[PDB]
Design a binder for this molecule. Sequence first.
Ligand code: VBE
Length: 112
Amino acid sequence: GKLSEQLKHCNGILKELLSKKHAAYAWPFYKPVDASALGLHDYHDIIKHPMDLSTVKRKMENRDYRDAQEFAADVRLMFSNCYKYNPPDHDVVAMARKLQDVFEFRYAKMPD
Ligand SMILES: CNC(=O)CN(C[C@@H](C)c1ccccc1)C(=O)c1cc(C)c(=O)n(C)c1
């Protein structure tokens, strides 16, 4: 019940974050940052634990997450990495803030 039900809620949130509804600001978070491709040669010196929605999806599909807290920690790690690496006035930070608003408001509706 509880753990399964809470992970169903997490899976629902994940599907929404990946949905066309949010694509305009979610797209930078779909796949791992390709630091080399973008010439971001300091990315892996600054970000020690990269995270993205494809990694969260793989972990959910593999039943890696044992509870909602573990799932939420990865989603927030993804946003934190964005806030750590990028100047706060960058468009990717505006997109991060918007997708995190979607995440936090629906995560708060967790079944007890
Ligand atoms: C499929 N391609 C992409 O997703 C390209 N981007 C986003 C783009 C707006 C961007 C490029 C270069 C520097 C900053 C932002 C990224 O790979 C990306 C995504 C995040 C969260 C991030 O924090 N960075 C630094 C980079």
